[model samples]
Target: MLAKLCKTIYPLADLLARPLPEGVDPLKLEIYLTDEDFEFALDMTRDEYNALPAWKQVNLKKAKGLF
Candidate 1:
């Protein structure tokens, strides 16, 4: 769950940081991670992570650059 959530949110955060066209609000692109998001992201076990398909894993290299 942690990996899945990270994979999803990381790219979203990156895209949100990009310069928007005129009249676009960056805040509008933001996603507030829910309590569930935080819980899964911070606490999912390694075995749980390994159970997911390879494609579901978070690309940490890309995510690190964004944050």
Candidate 2:
């Protein structure tokens, strides 16, 4: 059945997915940056960044190597 196929495929698909660069592990990084880099990295204003939820804000920082 379609549901059973999905259950089998999803885990295997995740494992076979491309790996990320080692340095990109956000948890192992810090959250300190110069104002210029922080502002320029995500191309967002202070208000905009502040408007994001806590988890989303963390992800933005991670995506920009702010941490």
Candidate 3:
């Protein structure tokens, strides 16, 4: 379930953090999902996920099947 959540959110994060070479077009940034990338996302989510307010946390937890 956590793995599936990561897969669902990956494209959004990839778009946000996409790196580009100096001469490369933004459209050609070639962002790709990797194990390391998912690990980093898990780390970030662990921190941010636990810090939400009570109501939001409950909702998110339920959504993510952690309820």
Candidate 4:
């Protein structure tokens, strides 16, 4: 099924599927991130997360949900 393909490709579909932060909801982007990406992201500094681009900011929080 296509849904199976998506979850296999994305690897973290449910997290990416969560609601985004206030005023920053863009269309959901299904993409794969590295283990290091999650490791770095899960403990990102306030300013670090704050400095990422809007869509990236969106991606970061979705990663946060995975945590």
Candidate 5:
């Protein structure tokens, strides 16, 4: 069950890290996690984060300046 938990919220972690528009409120966001945002904050390491399955690693690189 833990794997399933991360499988879903993990992507959400990446999604929340993306650039947002003006006036966006972080407080109102449905899927948000600041306590452990460090992980989503950026790629601590691409290989490690991307090691997860594609479905869960959706924005792994994007958070790490995929540009």
Candidate 6:
């Protein structure tokens, strides 16, 4: 009975987990980008991009094939 209950609860536990990125290097990440290139690639304006927090901004760049 305990094992059965544990099995049922396990899926939800995994659902709460997310694959977050780590060791997000910001210095090396910037040299590869230009304002125009990034704006076009992400389909966002400078004002819109500037609105996000720095952490989110860097991570966004990282996700878009940057280091």
The candidate that wins on TM-score is 2
Clashing pairs in 3: none
Score residue 20 of candidate 4 by CA lDDT.
41
Sort by TM-score, best first: what order?
A: 2, 6, 4, 3, 1, 5
CA lDDT of every candidate: 0.35, 0.43, 0.37, 0.44, 0.40, 0.41
TM-score for each of the candidates: 0.23, 0.38, 0.28, 0.29, 0.22, 0.36
Tell me the RMSD of model 5 versus the true structure. 11.4
Clashing pairs in 5: none
lDDT of 6 by residue, 14-61 (tens): 222333223222353332234554453434434556686667776765
Model 5, backbone clash pairs (residues 3+ apart or across chains), number: 0
Candidate 3, which segments miss by more than 4 Å at Cα? 1-44
Task: Give per-residue CA lDDT, model 4, range 3-52, as digits (tens).
Answer: 56432223344344455443222353222333444344444443454566
- Backbone atom clashes (below 3 Å) for every candidate: 0, 0, 0, 0, 0, 0
How far does residue 60 in candidate 2 sit from its true spot (Å)? Answer: 1.4
Candidate 6 backbone collisions, by pair: none
Per-model RMSD to reference: 12.7, 14.3, 12.5, 12.4, 11.4, 16.6
- A best-first ranking of the candidates according to their lDDT comes to 4, 2, 6, 5, 3, 1
Judged by whole-model lDDT over C-alpha atoms, candidate 3 comes out at: 0.37
